[PDB]
Amino acid sequence: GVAAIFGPSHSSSANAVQSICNALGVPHIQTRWKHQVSDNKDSFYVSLYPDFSSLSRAILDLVQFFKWKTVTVVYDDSTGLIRLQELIKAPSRYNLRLKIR
Amino acid sequence: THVLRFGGIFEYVESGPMGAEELAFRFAVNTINRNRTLLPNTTLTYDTQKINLYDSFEASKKACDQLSLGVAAIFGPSHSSSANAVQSICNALGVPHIQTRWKHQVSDNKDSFYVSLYPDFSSLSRAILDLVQFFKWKTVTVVYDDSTGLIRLQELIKAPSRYNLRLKIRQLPADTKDAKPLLKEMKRGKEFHVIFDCSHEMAAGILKQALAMGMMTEYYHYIFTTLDLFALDVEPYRYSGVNMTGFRILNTENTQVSSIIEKWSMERLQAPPKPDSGLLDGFMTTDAALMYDAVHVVSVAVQQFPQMTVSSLQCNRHKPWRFGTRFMSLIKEAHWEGLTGRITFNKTNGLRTDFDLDVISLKEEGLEKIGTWDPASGLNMTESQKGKPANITDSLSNRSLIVTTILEEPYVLFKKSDKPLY
Amino acid sequence: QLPADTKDAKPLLKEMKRGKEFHVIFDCSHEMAAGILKQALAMGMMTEYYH
Ligand SMILES: *[C@@H]1O[C@H](CO)[C@@H](O[C@@H]2O[C@H](CO)[C@@H](O[C@@H]3O[C@H](CO[C@H]4O[C@H](CO)[C@@H](O)[C@H](O)[C@@H]4O)[C@@H](O)[C@H](O[C@H]4O[C@H](CO)[C@@H](O)[C@H](O)[C@@H]4O)[C@@H]3O)[C@H](O)[C@H]2NC(C)=O)[C@H](O)[C@H]1NC(C)=O
Ligand SMILES: *[C@@H]1O[C@H](CO)[C@@H](O[C@@H]2O[C@H](CO)[C@@H](O)[C@H](O)[C@H]2NC(C)=O)[C@H](O)[C@H]1NC(C)=O
Ligand SMILES: *[C@@H]1O[C@H](CO)[C@@H](O)[C@H](O)[C@H]1NC(C)=O
Numbered sequence A: 001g002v003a004a005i006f007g008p009s010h011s012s013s014a015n016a017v018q019s020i021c022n023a024l025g026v027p028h029i030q031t032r033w034k035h036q037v038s039d040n041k042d043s044f045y046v047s048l049y050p051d052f053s054s055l056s057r058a059i060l061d062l063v064q065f066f067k068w069k070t071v072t073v074v075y076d077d078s079t080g081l082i083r084l085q086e087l088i089k090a091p092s093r094y095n096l097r098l099k100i101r
Numbered sequence B: 001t002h003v004l005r006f007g008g009i010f011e012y013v014e015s016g017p018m019g020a021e022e023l024a025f026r027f028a029v030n031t032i033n034r035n036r037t038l039l040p041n042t043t044l045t046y047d048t049q050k051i052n053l054y055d056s057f058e059a060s061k062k063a064c065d066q067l068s069l070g071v072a073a074i075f076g077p078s079h080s081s082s083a084n085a086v087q088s089i090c091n092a093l094g095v096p097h098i099q100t101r102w103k104h105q106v107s108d109n110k111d112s113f114y115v116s117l118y119p120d121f122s123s124l125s126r127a128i129l130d131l132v133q134f135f136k137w138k139t140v141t142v143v144y145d146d147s148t149g150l151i152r153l154q155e156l157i158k159a160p161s162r163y164n165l166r167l168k169i170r171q172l173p174a175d176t177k178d179a180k181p182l183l184k185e186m187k188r189g190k191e192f193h194v195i196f197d198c199s200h201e202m203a204a205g206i207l208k209q210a211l212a213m214g215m216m217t218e219y220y221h222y223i224f225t226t227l228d229l230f231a232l233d234v235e236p237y238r239y240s241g242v243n244m245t246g247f248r249i250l251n252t253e254n255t256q257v258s259s260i261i262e263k264w265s266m267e268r269l270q271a272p273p274k275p276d277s278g279l280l281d282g283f284m285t286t287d288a289a290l291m292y293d294a295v296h297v298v299s300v301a302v303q304q305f306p307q308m309t310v311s312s313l314q315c316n317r318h319k320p321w322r323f324g325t326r327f328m329s330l331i332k333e334a335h336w337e338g339l340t341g342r343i344t345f346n347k348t349n350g351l352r353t354d355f356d357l358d359v360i361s362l363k364e365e366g367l368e369k370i371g372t373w374d375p376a377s378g379l380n381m382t383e384s385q386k387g388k389p390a391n392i393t394d395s396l397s398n399r400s401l402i403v404t405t406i407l408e409e410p411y412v413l414f415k416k417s418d419k420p421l422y
Numbered sequence C: 001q002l003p004a005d006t007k008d009a010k011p012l013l014k015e016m017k018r019g020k021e022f023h024v025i026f027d028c029s030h031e032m033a034a035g036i037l038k039q040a041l042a043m044g045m046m047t048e049y050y051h
């Protein structure tokens, strides 16, 4: 008998609890960013983490304030490319030249 | 031994025919049952159940439902969100979990009871990267479809750190196949070497917009990252002079491999028609082609192990299956010449990282092979294009004109320069 | 000249690509105007380089 699940803080584990919280009707508050699949037909969950959608606007506004041309984005895990997906798409419109390591 | 029940977890078509993978799983079981050469005194039985492909709670229950009456294997929920949940159940209960669809591997997975017969993109993204250097490109414009697509090409995004490629990564619009505002942007950048990463559904969806847009000329190359270009209608495209180069793994050249496919369309016999899609007859899509290879790899591992008696394992009272570790190594070090070439697994992983690819391309005679890729070897191109055998000529040149010249003063006298000269 | 009555003008349009012929002034009827441009789109010739 519980009222609010508070975010197991993984990407693998949080998806499994989310479908359970979907079915049972209990809410599922998250505090960590998660790769949300484009058609998981769920809204019984919040995620109180600043989204890397808007956080990538903040980086892209910042790197063209400093007028960089040779940015060298370096990640640490394969999930991180999704976290920076707006910055990876950035050379399509400006004169930035990425090089990802 | 006996019945040896397998377990199937498939999609929820909801008043249509059964799915292409579910037919493929039920075609392979029925074939090996009636072929007494492979697995002679056994008789396999399937157990297929239906899920929404997006509710892992349904995928977890139907796993523990199939584990309750007992299965010997789980042949994948075939979707990234649901497959990870059923992977964690099958590892905690011992039972292997044969996958056919590419999922995201989290780096700290710590899991061993899974094999995936889908060819992993870390082997594939090297093979795309070997074509973009065989074709000597410098400007490519990789286009993916959803946010997972960046992971599938991470060995292609890291590539300009060693070479001269200048990637221009773009994303398709969300779900609608109106990619005309994308293709208007791609014309104005003179982007001539697109490396699309759709499925074979959206590959037909783009090229009807990509032909309506004036972009199907001899100035455009299109590499696809699907394995189903062979089942794509190319009749409105064959004369355009375009270049559609892609990979097929389904070895339709062999007689025994091809003869299944007409028997496949014989057992299909309806193939729900959509002539305005831009697709051919079904032709055993690779999601179904691997499922027919999925049963045959498991059929080898039960052939060398007649000790499996499937018992009733619980879900909330988890206890590892008796021969779980023993039978899993029979899967992971197996070997079978199936539809898609030789089948091996990575002894660290269980992921197919050594296999065979055809490097089929688009000619005016149809869609034919021009080479063969091999993770060990590389591109073994059949570069001979003897439709027009004589191709180019070169130019005789400078030759430097060696002048026989002795030293005599004041003619060819040496210099008093205070260094060595060349 | 177009081939006699058949609307298979693809052997014509193969000859027209190799001459870089960019300013065609067709004199069909409105029936054969539709007949050519389905071959002229299947041939890679409907770009911004053709009038
Ligand atoms: C799955 O199983 C395989 C083999 O059983 C294990 O090994 C991986 O797969 C191959 C085989 O060894 C390796 O691929 C090679 O990678 C090279 C990368 O160069 C360097 O890259 C970084 C620096 O950027 C270094 O950290 C790294 O150590 C390398 O020194 C390629 O350059 C290699 O050369 C050829 O590649 C293709 C042909 O295959 C062509 O483009 C050229 O001919 C080129 O010369 C080669 O491809 C791979 O690196 C191995 N490791 C990994 C981690 O993938 C796997 O470990 C095993 N497990 C997994 C999870 O894959
Ligand atoms: C790209 O497409 C063009 C046209 O479709 C190919 O060029 C011709 O291909 C035919 C094959 O039937 C040959 O007979 C011709 O000699 C080719 N023409 C020239 C000028 O070479 C071309 O081969 C394709 N490129 C690749 C890499 O497949
Ligand atoms: C069964 O498999 C054997 C093994 O190669 C083969 O010789 C035989 O033709 C197969 N029979 C059928 C009906 O597929």
Ligand SMILES: *[C@@H]1O[C@H](CO)[C@@H](O)[C@H](O)[C@H]1NC(C)=O
Binding pocket: B040, B041
């Ligand atoms: C057939 O059954 C017999 C006895 O039941 C067994 O010894 C044999 O291994 C089985 N398989 C064959 C002959 O392939």
Ligand SMILES: *[C@@H]1O[C@H](CO)[C@@H](O)[C@H](O)[C@H]1NC(C)=O
Binding pocket: B377, B380
């Ligand atoms: C590529 O295939 C040809 C055809 O037999 C042959 O030269 C050889 O098998 C391959 N080449 C190399 C260098 O391995």
